[PDB]
UniProtKB/Swiss-Prot annotation, chain D:
Its EC number is 7.1.1.-. NDH-1 shuttles electrons from NADH, via FMN and iron-sulfur (Fe-S) centers, to quinones in the respiratory chain. The immediate electron acceptor for the enzyme in this species is believed to be a menaquinone. Couples the redox reaction to proton translocation (for every two electrons transferred, four hydrogen ions are translocated across the cytoplasmic membrane), and thus conserves the redox energy in a proton gradient. One of its GO terms (cellular component) is plasma membrane. This is NADH-quinone oxidoreductase subunit K. NDH-1 is composed of 14 different subunits. Subunits NuoA, H, J, K, L, M, N constitute the membrane sector of the complex. Belongs to the complex I subunit 4L family. It comes from Mycolicibacterium smegmatis (strain ATCC 700084 / mc(2)155) (Mycobacterium smegmatis). It is found in: Cell membrane.
Length: 517, 519, 190, 99, 57
């Protein structure tokens, strides 16, 4: 059996090294090679998904090797439905981001002319680390790459991006790294607890073994210690996936970074936080997660509503999209921690759908912002007349983020809301208010920017808003097609997701409550 | 007659003989040939030392160590591991020291790229100093002195008696006191650094010898094994033992740089020659923590319940004050010195573990961090102001990475290693020490060091921000090669710092095999 | 454990002298006074060593510290002044009181830690000094501590190297000889 | 007289020496105070050697004397350099490195 | 207002506290060798801590 996951995560990294090592004069060849590497990673992901059997064992394509036995951590890769979903999302998105940021790094000077090569290599490295984290079945390996993938994105923000790129990058890296270090505390605590338990030959980081031990009850732990470890993991993932109120880093980073990098952050990278929640926080600390479920459920619902309200209140398009993404992550976490088959399956499908939808919306907004020179909502008007295709695609992406049933995200949001009510009715209604709030902050922005008289300098002047160029269409059309497909026919995704989620529930002793009737 | 194990002493004997031979070269060799010989005598000598170490290491694959000189020296697995680490770091540091001026029309390049004034006795800026610089004279006495430092440092982990360990402390301290005052540029600051380091080191060494006296009184023996036997058997006074432990801890903590004793490190690192500063910050820390490990895991394990809390109060402080102070620092050298204080605290957390995992984690931490520090300071030595002085001002580093992407990436790698980011040897290193502490029941230190690392990440990251995300200033500094030796040092150091992050199990098996002292 | 009454008197007088000498070294406003007090303290400590069955150690103390304190006196003349009276006024705000408090606390804590130790038995050194104190010291030094003995040579070499590197002015600063100074154009002369 | 007095005296001398290093600006006086501290350690070693009926403490005192001499010489060299550059032997004058 | 002043406010306050503490601690680095020697003689704190560990904390 070929080491499919090893190749999957290594190809982006090796390609990044090659691209950065390319001569400065090979900028165009560097772009094409980076795109080829991303497409090769996508092909690897495709073969993995096709070979994946959702009815088979929980983890497939499992590769195991001794990496650092001294730390009780091994190079253990393996993909389940949850991990496979995010792997597919990342693999499909990254090529689209590359062709979206095709010319983003052209304006940067210095750096020995490696600006384009540096940008592409950083993007590929982020892809590789994200994939490796998703496929990792070892707690310490997962944490290694979860914390590692910050620095390439830190460079990708601070390098390139807007005027405030420095401050935005610092806030990004410091929030996420404070969370990651708080994780490290809990990871070392977990190692200590496992070593102090007879259930394992020594301190262990093998995720599958620890999960089996905790589920079987052999690895009993003092509830306080498990609670603290769960709190550390949760804080780390909450800063990573912008769970309210730990979200405050995301808006600045998203606005300041280039649109492609911002999408890579929110659409792909931040999903790792929610995935880490769903997998580790639940399967390692089922008791602690159950105990804290009310608190984090309340936090996620507050995040949903609060992010929607702020998005309504934002005067900046990109910041508005960032807060929309925060609210959607609130949905994701709410669906994860309601511990219901509907809830968790919907949260995973929402990871996918929000990734694609935010990618589309943020990239279209970035194209529009690039046409002009300001991100202000009031800076635009009547853009439909000048750029019918740009405005139409923006409308479609907004409707996706608005959770129309004709588009994928609704199927997910609905699924989450359903799952929420079976356990927490009031929280479910409070979240459902975000259905109206999304209509508000999407359609009001569309009215402000796309409708009305063509504002000065939009259809004329030195910086007119020309319609989407063919490359931007290449970026957009696949995303809109994916949204439509996953809205109309989500089953292919759910068939993959539903088994894994069931296993997760089966592992944590949770089951969807039976109907009252 | 007393049996002398020359084979075991082989690395130490080689280093000291090479130092004496270098003094002979200074004495009876012509000026024009002094530098080629010294460096050739020095580097080769250290290489021999490294070879000796591995042979000794192979010899130690049998007996779990053995005393050499009728006690007073013990080469067990931790001792040989630290000796090999110190030998490698000394090789790199001497390659940094031997760097001469890049190039000039006159052949009077004078070992200046390594910051060494041609005539230390000459007054700063005086006509004598200018004439010495023009003539290209160099005080090659640096190479003997450095070797002696390494000599003493190689002894300091291996000293199995209080007297021998005190003598090693003095032997390594005096050459460093002298070397701190030889900087080519900013001579006033270098002389101030030498004076401060000498005064505080003499003060600390007085404390160290007084503590040795107290331990001898309590146990009636100078061998660490004897002290352990006495304290465990309860034969000793048990109050003199604690007082001596405290006083000796004062000296070792000064040498490593705990907050109550840190204040010397910032000034000395800023003022001392950059090459000397790098070699110091790596190898002196390695040797001092080796001696501390021997004291706590061999000499006085039995009093863990008594000195464990004190170290806590220090370690916490060393992690907090060392990091918080670095936050507002505006000088790269000073920031790195405070980082060194913080990393001393992190080491002390692993030392506090009081378990074999603690020993292994500390050894690995010292190896990796010594390499990272040496590389970072070597890189800092290359950023030269227009006037030629090292542009240590952090604001002046703005856009440095954009101008010099390779050096910038290397320095960012070192900074992230210090911050402890995964995939860098620094993270593996911090994880080892914190895991050892957690297994030892000191998980509150794991938490506090986690918070301290979060704080320190800010000032490690601000440097990268200036280096890459900021546009270069009009008067931005420029790199100076200056020779093959410096590039080799930087590349070797970066390669090690990256490999020990990606693939640490090599040398981690070595650390594990050296988790036991010869009690 | 109790020492001889004559030894008690010797300790009292000589240790009072040593303590006064240390206090003078710290407090003597004249540097030469501090050097003289240091000499007094070293000689008093040598006498105490002699009283404590360490004849060779005491005599070596007297010899070497006489020499060393004389050199320190020379350097006081060369660097500080012949009869300069230092002010000793605290130049660092609040440093004098803090230093006095720290010293007092450290001394008190050290004495408390020492407590009573000789109560736990005080072996007479006569057993070891039997066969000669110097012979016993030689047996220990060159058998048990030969390594430290050899390393003292490294200490000496480092001291010499430091003195030469930092203090030995080279050709570029050599003072002109009377012969050289007697020829300049026409030296003083014209 | 109880032999512990010898230790107490050392504790005083060492303490006094420490205080000197804190109170006196002259570098030479600092060397004298360091010598006081090291000789207090020597006195402690001699007393303990007497108590334990062996000469090891005396040997350690001898080695401490050697160390004190070497340290004093190195400090003298450093102070000569600093004086030649600055024309002063006050430690407080070497204050450039701060904050 | 809550986002700009309260949520972001906690992080801003933490950063300001760290900066103020850093400035205060850096003020301790007076640059005088004698002040550093005083801090080291603060090792009386180490001595008393070690002794008191036997005196029941």
């Amino acid at each position: 059996t070929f080491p499919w996951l090893t190749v999957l995560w290594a190809v982006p990294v090796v390609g990044a090294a090659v691209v950065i090592l390319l001569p400065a004069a090979q900028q165009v060849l560097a772009k094409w090679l980076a795109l080829a590497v991303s497409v090769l990673t996508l092909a690897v992901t495709a073969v993995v998904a096709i070979g994946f059997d959702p009815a088979a064992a929980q983890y497939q394509f499992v590769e195991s090797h001794r990496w650092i036995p001294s730390f009780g951590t091994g190079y253990i890769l393996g993909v389940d439905g949850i991990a496979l979903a995010l792997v597919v999302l990342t693999a499909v998105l990254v090529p689209l981001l590359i062709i979206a940021g095709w010319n983003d790094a052209s304006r940067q000077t210095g750096l020995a002319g490696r600006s384009v090569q540096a940008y592409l290599a950083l993007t590929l490295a982020v892809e590789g680390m994200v994939l490796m984290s998703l496929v990792a079945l070892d707690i310490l390996l997962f944490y290694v790459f979860f914390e590692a993938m910050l620095i390439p994105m830190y460079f990708l923000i601070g390098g390139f991006g807007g005027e405030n790129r420095s401050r935005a990058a610092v806030k990004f890296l410091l929030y996420n790294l404070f969370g990651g270090l708080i994780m490290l505390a809990a990871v070392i605590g977990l190692y200590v607890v496992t070593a102090g338990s007879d259930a394992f030959a020594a301190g262990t980081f093998d995720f599958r073994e620890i999960v089996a031990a905790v589920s079987s009850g052999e690895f009993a732990v003092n509830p306080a210690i498990m609670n603290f470890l769960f709190l550390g993991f949760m804080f780390a993932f909450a800063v990573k996936a912008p769970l309210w109120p730990f979200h405050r880093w995301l808006p600045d980073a998203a606005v300041e970074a280039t649109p492609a990098s911002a999408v890579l952050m929110m659409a792909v990278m931040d999903k790792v936080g929610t995935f880490g929640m769903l997998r580790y926080c639940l399967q390692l600390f089922p008791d602690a997660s159950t105990y804290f479920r009310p608190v984090v459920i309340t936090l996620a619902a507050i995040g949903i509503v609060y992010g929607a309200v702020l998005a309504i209140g934002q005067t900046d398009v990109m910041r508005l999209i960032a807060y929309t993404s925060i609210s959607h992550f609130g949905f994701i976490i709410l669906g994860i921690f309601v511990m219901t088959s509907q809830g968790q399956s919907g949260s995973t499908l929402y990871m996918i759908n929000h990734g694609i939808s935010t990618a589309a919306l943020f990239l279209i907004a970035g194209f529009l912002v690039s046409r002009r020179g300001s991100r202000l909502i009031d800076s635009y008007g009547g853009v439909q007349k000048v750029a019918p295709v740009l405005a139409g695609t923006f409308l479609v992406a907004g409707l996706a983020t608005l959770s129309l049933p004709g588009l994928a995200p609704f199927i997910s949001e609905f699924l989450v809301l359903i799952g929420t009510f079976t356990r927490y009715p009031v929280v479910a209604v409070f979240a459902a208010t975000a259905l109206v709030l999304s209509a508000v902050y999407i359609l009001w922005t569309y009215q402000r920017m796309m409708t009305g008289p063509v504002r000065d300098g939009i259809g004329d002047g030195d910086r007119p808003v020309r319609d989407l160029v063919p490359r931007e269409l290449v970026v957009v059309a696949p995303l809109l097609a994916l949204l439509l497909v996953l809205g109309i026919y989500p089953k292919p995704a759910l068939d993959v997701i539903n088994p894994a989620v069931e296993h997760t529930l089966t592992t944590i002793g949770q089951t969807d409550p039976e109907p009252t009737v | 007659t007393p049996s002398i194990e020359y084979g075991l002493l082989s690395p130490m004997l080689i280093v000291f003989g090479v130092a004496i031979a270098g003094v002979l070269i200074e004495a009876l060799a012509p000026r024009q040939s002094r530098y080629p010989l010294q460096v050739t005598l020095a580097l080769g000598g250290l290489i021999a030392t490294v070879v000796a170490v591995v042979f000794v290491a192979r010899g130690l694959s049998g007996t779990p160590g053995r005393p050499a000189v009728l006690g007073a020296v013990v080469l067990d697995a931790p001792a040989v591991f630290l000796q090999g680490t110190i030998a490698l770091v000394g090789i790199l540091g001497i390659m940094l020291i031997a760097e001469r001026q890049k190039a000039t029309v006159s052949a009077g390049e004078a070992r200046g790229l390594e910051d060494f004034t041609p005539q230390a006795s000459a007054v700063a800026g005086s006509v004598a100093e200018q004439l010495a610089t023009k003539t290209g004279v160099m005080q090659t006495e640096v190479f003997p002195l450095t070797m002696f430092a390494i000599g003493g440092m190689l002894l300091f982990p291996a000293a199995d008696d209080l007297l021998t360990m005190f003598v090693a402390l003095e032997v390594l301290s005096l050459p460093l006191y002298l070397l701190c005052g030889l900087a080519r540029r900013r001579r006033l600051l270098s002389q101030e650094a030498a004076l401060k380091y000498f005064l505080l080191g003499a003060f600390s060494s007085a404390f160290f010898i007084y503590g040795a006296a107290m331990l001898y009184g309590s146990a009636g023996t100078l061998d660490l094994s004897g002290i352990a036997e006495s304290v465990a058997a309860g034969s000793g006074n048990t109050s003199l033992a604690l007082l001596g432990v405290a006083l000796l801890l004062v000296g070792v903590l000064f040498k490593v740089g705990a907050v109550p004793f840190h204040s010397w490190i910032p000034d000395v690192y800023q003022g001392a020659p950059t090459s000397i500063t790098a070699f110091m910050a790596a190898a002196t820390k390695i040797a001092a923590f080796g001696a501390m490990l021997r004291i706590f895991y061999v000499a006085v394990p039995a009093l863990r319940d008594d000195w464990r809390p004190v170290l806590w109060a220090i370690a916490i402080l060393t992690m907090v004050v060392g990091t918080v102070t670095a936050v507002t620092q505006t000088d790269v050298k000073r920031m790195l010195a405070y980082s060194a204080v913080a990393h001393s605290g992190f080491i002390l957390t692993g030392v506090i573990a009081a378990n074999p995992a603690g020993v292994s984690s500390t050894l690995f931490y010292l190896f990796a961090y010594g390499f990272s520090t040496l590389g970072a300071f070597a890189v800092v030595g290359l950023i030269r102001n227009a006037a030629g002085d090292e542009e240590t001002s952090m604001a002046q580093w703005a856009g440095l990475g954009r101008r010099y992407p390779i050096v910038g990436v290397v320095f960012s790698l070192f900074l992230l290693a210090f911050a402890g980011i995964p995939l860098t040897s620094g993270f593996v290193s911090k994880f080892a020490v914190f895991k050892a502490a957690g297994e030892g029941g000191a998980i509150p230190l794991v938490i506090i060091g986690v918070i301290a690392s979060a704080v320190a990440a800010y000032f490690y990251v601000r440097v990268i921000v200036l280096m890459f995300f900021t546009e270069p200033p009009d008067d931005a500094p420029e790199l100076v090669v200056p020779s093959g030796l410096s590039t080799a040092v930087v590349t070797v150091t970066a390669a090690v710092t990256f490999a020990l992050g990606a693939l640490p199990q090599p040398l981690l098996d070595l650390a594990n095999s050296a988790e036991t002292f010869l009690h | 454990a109790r020492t001889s009454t004559s030894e008690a008197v010797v300790f009292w007088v000589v240790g009072t002298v040593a303590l006064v000498g240390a206090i003078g070294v710290v407090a003597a406003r004249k540097a030469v006074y501090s050097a003289v007090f240091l000499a007094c303290t070293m000689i008093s400590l040598a006498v105490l060593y002699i009283a404590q069955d360490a004849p060779f150690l005491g005599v070596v103390q007297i010899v070497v510290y006489t020499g060393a304190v004389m050199m320190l006196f020379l350097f006081v003349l060369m660097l500080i002044g012949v009869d300069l009276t230092e002010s000793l006024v605290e130049t660092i705000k609040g440093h004098r009181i803090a230093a006095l408090i720290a010293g007092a606390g450290f001394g008190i804590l050290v004495i408390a830690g020492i407590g009573n130790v000789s109560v736990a038995g005080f072996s007479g050194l006569a057993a070891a000094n039997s066969g000669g104190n110097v012979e016993g010291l030689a047996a220990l030094i060159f058998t048990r501590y030969l390594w430290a003995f050899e390393l003292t040579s490294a200490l000496l070499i480092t001291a010499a190297l430091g003195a030469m590197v930092l203090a030995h002015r080279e050709r570029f600063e050599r003072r002109k000889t009377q012969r050289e100074l007697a020829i300049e154009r026409f030296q003083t002369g014209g | 007289m109880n032999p512990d007095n010898y230790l107490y005296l050392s504790a005083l001398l060492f303490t006094i020496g420490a205080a000197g290093v804190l109170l006196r600006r002259n570098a030479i006086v600092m060397f004298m105070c360091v010598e006081l501290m090291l000789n207090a350690a020597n006195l402690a070693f001699v007393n303990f050697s007497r108590m334990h009926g062996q000469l090891d403490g005396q040997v350690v005192a001898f080695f401490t004397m050697v160390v004190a001499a070497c340290e004093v010489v190195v400090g003298l060299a450093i102070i000569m350099a600093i004086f030649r550059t600055r024309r002063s032997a006050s430690v407080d004058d070497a204050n450039l490195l701060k904050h | 207002t809550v986002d700009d002043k309260a949520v972001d406010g906690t992080a801003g306050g933490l950063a300001a506290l760290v900066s103020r503490t850093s400035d205060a601690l850096r003020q301790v680095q007076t640059g005088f060798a004698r002040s550093y020697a005083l801090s080291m003689l603060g090792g009386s704190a180490l001595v008393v801590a070690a002794i008191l560990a036997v005196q029941l904390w």
